[PDB]
Design a protein around this ligand. Structure first.
Ligand code: SF4
Length: 350
């Protein structure tokens, strides 16, 4: 059975044609899937039995399942999501005017960024389209589908710190196409943001495939620091990454001219005022908005949290050069064993 969550609108229409159905039936089923978060053909009431029968034989709608849910007092929701026998994260961050979903692109990651908890476990595999868009679908079903509640559950999707998306371009791009589709989640290209640590040839490729908002996972004011913090910098240095960013902005207007620059503040490693002055000089030819991230250590992380006074001084330095600078909020602060699986088998035996 084909999982319909693997298909963009064009592919859905091609599949429905091969079942002897008119293209617009594919569009209709898409709306049920994404506007109503429906994974059950019986519930699709304006589809006839014959078509319902065809789909149940050759197709299904199977989104990744929640294995854990944590809910913050600030409304943030974090999910551990089963993708096969592997696990990934999905985070829902509601605000008064919008709701952002952070989704995973890979199971683990191969880039070895030193501050990243996703890195420490290493790279396992790429996610399929159904596993990426399925995170959005699952989040949307739980929060409340657009046409069930009358409100878009999600206005923004981000891909950051949950696998390098540019190393999973085959699955990431169609997933984003469904996010942007009116019959999918109907998000503006300005509100689908792909963060990358700078896989430059893949970024050149991204701009030829799709127009979405780009963020750059920079985290350092110079190569010698970034070489340490973000090892991929050894292969593609800052100036090469920035040249690639400018090339991407020739092809895409989702950023409206200004790339988002992400920068984790790491205690006495990259958060000094000297580093801020260097960053300002570095970004003089790159129109941008700078997002400073008050990063917190995971168990055994090689860095500590920067104080808010150091972060605020770093920010003021950047603002004195005229950069738009945002210190990001920490969300879901209240929610932030190797034997357990075997231990559960033994306990359930009794
Ligand atoms: S590219 Fe992103 S997910 Fe991968 S190790 Fe670096 S910060 Fe973590």
């Amino acid at each position: 059975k084909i999982n319909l969550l693997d298909l963009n609108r064009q592919q859905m229409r091609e599949f429905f044609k091969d079942l002897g159905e008119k293209p617009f039936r594919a569009d209709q089923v898409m709306k049920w899937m994404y506007h109503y978060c429906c994974d059950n053909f019986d519930e699709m009431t304006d589809i006839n039995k014959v078509l319902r029968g065809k789909l149940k034989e050759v197709a299904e709608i199977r989104a990744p399942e929640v294995v854990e849910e944590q809910r913050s007092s600030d409304g943030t929701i974090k999910w551990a999501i089963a993708v096969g026998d592997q696990r990934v994260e999905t985070v829902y961050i509601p605000e008064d005017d919008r709701a952002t979903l952070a989704v995973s692109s890979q199971v683990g990651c191969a880039l070895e960024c030193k501050f990243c908890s996703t890195a420490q476990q290493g790279f396992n595999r790429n996610l399929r389209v159904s596993e990426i868009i399925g995170q959005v679908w699952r989040a949307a079903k739980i929060v409340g589908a657009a046409k069930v509640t009358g409100q878009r559950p999600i206005t923004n999707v981000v891909m950051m710190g949950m696998g390098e998306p540019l190393l999973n371009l085959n699955n990431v791009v169609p997933a984003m196409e469904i996010m942007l589709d009116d019959f999918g989640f109907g998000l503006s290209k300005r509100r689908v943001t792909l963060s990358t640590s700078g896989v430059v040839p893949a970024l050149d490729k991204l701009g030829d495939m799709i127009d979405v908002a780009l963020a750059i996972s920079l985290h350092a004011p110079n190569d010698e620091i970034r070489d340490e913090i973000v090892p991929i910098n050894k292969k593609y240095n800052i100036e090469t990454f920035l040249a690639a960013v400018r090339r991407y902005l020739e092809k895409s207007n989702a950023n409206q001219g200004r790339v988002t620059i992400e920068y984790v503040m790491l205690d006495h490693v990259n958060d000094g005022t000297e580093h801020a002055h260097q960053l300002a000089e570095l970004l003089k030819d790159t129109p941008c908005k700078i997002n400073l991230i008050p990063w917190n250590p995971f168990p055994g992380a090689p860095y500590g949290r920067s104080s808010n006074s150091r972060i605020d001084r770093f920010s003021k330095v950047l603002m004195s050069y005229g950069f738009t600078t945002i210190v990001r909020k920490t969300r879901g602060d209240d929610i932030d064993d190797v034997i357990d699986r075997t231990k559960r088998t033994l306990r359930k035996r009794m």
